[PDB]
C-alpha cells in the first residue's frame, strides 16, 4: 500500500523533486545510452606522435 500510494502520486511534485535523485533524465537523453558506461565531452584522436 505504500508503493501503491507512491504510484498514485507520480503525476505530482515527485516528478521534479525526488528525495535523493535529481530528475528522470531518460526523456532528455537519447534512447538507451547506458549512462554508467559513457564518457561525456570531446576527446583527442592522438594522431601525430
Amino acid at each position: 500500500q505504500k508503493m501503491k500510494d507512491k504510484k498514485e502520486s507520480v503525476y505530482f511534485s515527485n516528478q521534479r523533486a525526488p528525495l535523493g535523485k535529481s530528475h528522470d533524465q531518460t526523456p532528455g537523453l537519447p534512447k538507451g545510452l547506458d549512462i554508467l558506461n559513457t564518457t561525456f565531452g570531446t576527446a583527442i584522436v592522438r594522431e601525430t606522435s
Binding site: 533524465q25 549512462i35 570531446t42 576527446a43
Partner: protein, 431 residues
C-alpha cells in the same frame, strides 16, 4: 610507495569517511568485503596474507550510534574493528567536554592506533583530518589530537578537511563558541586547512546538478571526490605529480594564514554534460566562477594570494597554460601585489570514477582548486562578531566553565583571533 593516513573525527568525520572510502574501494578493484577479484592501492590500503586489504584510516566518535551502523552494515568486513574507536557518551556541543574529561580518556588509544598504522608503512607523507568546526568532538577531540600528533611525529604534514559553519544557515546555537575555541588551538599547530561549508554545496547541488532537496550523502560524495582528486597525484602516474608535502608549502605564506577555499570544476549531471563542451579553457574558468565554490564568499572583493591547479584525465599542458594566461588578463580576477605569478599545476593520467547511484556524470577532464584568498577573512569577522554578540550577555558560558575550562580562555581565544583580522588586512594592502 607514498602512503596516507586518514583520521575521521565525529559524525561529520565518519559519514564523510563512509563516502570517501566507498569511492576509494570503487576506484581500485576493491569489493566492500575487502577482496580484490597493479600496485596503486598502497596509498590507502594495506595487504594481508589472506588476500585481504585493510584501509589506513581511523574513525573516532564518542557517540557510538554513528560507527554502530558502520559496524552493522555491509562494510563490516572491510574496516579493522580496532581502528573503529567509539566512546560511551558524546561531547554535546561543548569544547570542554571533548577537551577536558573524555577528551583525554581515549587519547592513549587513538595515538596507539596511529602509531601501529605508522609502523606498517615505509614512506609516510602526511595526515588527513576530517572533522567539523561547529561540532562537539570535531572541535574538541580533533583539535587536541592534532596538537598531540604535532609533537609525536613532527616533520609530516597535517592537512585538515574542515566543515566550516555556513553563513546564514546553521544547526547549533553554541557553534560560534566551539568554532572560535577550535580555531584558537589549530593556528599554531596545523599546517594548512582546506575547508568547505554546507550552504554552498546546497546551492551547487540545486543549480549545477538538477537535484533539489539533497541529503548529506549528496554532499559527502562531492567531498570524497575532491579529497580523492587531491591525493590522485600520489597513486596514479602523471606528467606533473604533486606530493603531499608540496601543497603544504606553496599555498601558505605565513603560518597564521593557512585557510584556503575548495572548488571542483566539472560538477554536472549527465543531461547538461551531454550537450556541453568540456574543454580545459571552459572548465578552468568555472573554477573562478563565484557560483562554483564550496565556501560562500565573493572573491572579487578579496585578493587571491596562492592557487593550486590539480588536473586529471586527458589534459595536455598548453591548454592549461594558455588557460591561466587568460586568467591574468581580466580585471575582475585580481591577485595580490607581493605575489607574482603564483599557480601550482599538477597533471594526472586518471579520469574520475563515478559511483553507481551517484549524481555526477562520467567525464574526461576534472579540476580541483585550492586557493588561498583574503576574502575568507570576512567569515572570521562574522564569526567573532557573533561571539561578541553572544559573549556580552554571558550566554551559555556556565556550560563551559563547570567542565574543566576557565573563563580566561575565552578571552585568550578571542584576543588570538582578533589578531587574525589585523593579519589578513595587512597582507592585502599595497606593499
Amino acid at each position: 610507495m607514498r602512503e596516507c593516513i586518514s583520521i575521521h573525527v565525529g559524525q561529520a568525520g565518519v559519514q564523510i569517511g563512509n563516502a570517501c572510502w566507498e569511492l576509494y574501494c570503487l576506484e581500485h578493484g576493491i569489493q566492500p568485503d575487502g577482496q580484490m577479484p597493479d600496485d596503486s592501492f598502497n596509498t590507502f590500503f594495506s595487504e594481508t596474507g589472506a588476500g585481504k586489504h585493510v584501509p589506513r584510516a581511523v574513525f573516532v566518535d564518542l557517540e557510538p550510534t554513528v560507527v554502530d551502523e558502520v559496524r552493522t552494515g555491509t562494510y563490516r568486513q572491510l574496516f579493522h574493528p580496532e581502528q573503529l574507536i567509539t566512546g560511551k557518551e558524546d561531547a554535546a556541543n561543548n569544547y570542554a567536554r571533548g577537551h577536558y574529561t573524555i577528551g583525554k580518556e581515549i587519547v592513549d588509544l587513538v595515538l596507539d592506533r596511529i602509531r601501529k598504522l605508522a609502523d606498517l608503512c615505509t614512506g609516510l607523507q602526511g595526515f588527513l583530518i576530517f572533522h567539523s568546526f561547529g561540532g562537539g568532538t570535531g572541535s574538541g577531540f580533533a583539535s587536541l589530537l592534532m596538537e598531540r600528533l604535532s609533537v609525536d611525529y613532527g616533520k609530516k604534514s597535517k592537512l585538515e578537511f574542515a566543515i566550516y559553519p555556513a553563513p546564514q544557515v546553521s544547526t547549533a546555537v553554541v557553534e560560534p563558541y566551539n568554532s572560535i575555541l577550535t580555531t584558537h588551538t589549530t593556528l599554531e599547530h596545523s599546517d594548512c586547512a582546506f575547508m568547505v561549508d554546507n550552504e554552498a554545496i546546497y546551492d551547487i547541488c540545486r543549480r549545477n546538478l538538477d537535484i533539489e532537496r539533497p541529503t548529506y550523502t549528496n554532499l559527502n560524495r562531492l567531498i570524497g571526490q575532491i579529497v580523492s582528486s587531491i591525493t590522485a597525484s600520489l597513486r596514479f602516474d602523471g606528467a606533473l605529480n604533486v606530493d603531499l608535502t608540496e601543497f603544504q608549502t606553496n599555498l601558505v605564506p605565513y603560518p597564521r594564514i593557512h585557510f584556503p577555499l575548495a572548488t571542483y570544476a566539472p560538477v554536472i549531471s549527465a543531461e547538461k554534460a551531454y550537450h556541453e563542451q568540456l574543454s580545459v579553457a571552459e572548465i578552468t574558468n568555472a573554477c573562478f566562477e563565484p557560483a562554483n565554490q564550496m565556501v560562500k564568499c565573493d572573491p572579487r572583493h578579496g585578493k587571491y594570494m596562492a592557487c593550486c591547479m590539480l588536473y586529471r584525465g586527458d589534459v595536455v599542458p598548453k591548454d592549461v597554460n594558455a588557460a591561466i594566461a587568460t586568467i591574468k588578463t581580466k580585471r575582475t580576477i585580481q591577485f595580490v601585489d607581493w605575489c607574482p605569478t603564483g599557480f601550482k599545476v599538477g597533471i594526472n593520467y586518471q579520469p574520475p570514477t563515478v559511483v553507481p547511484g551517484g549524481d555526477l556524470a562520467k567525464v574526461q577532464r576534472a579540476v580541483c582548486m585550492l586557493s588561498n584568498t583574503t576574502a575568507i577573512a570576512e567569515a572570521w569577522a562574522r564569526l567573532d562578531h557573533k561571539l561578541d554578540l553572544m559573549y556580552a550577555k554571558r550566554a551559555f558560558v556556565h556550560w563551559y566553565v563547570g567542565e574543566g575550562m576557565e573563563e580566561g580562555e575565552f578571552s585568550e581565544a578571542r584576543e588570538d583571533l582578533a589578531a587574525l583580522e589585523k593579519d589578513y588586512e595587512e597582507v592585502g594592502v599595497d606593499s
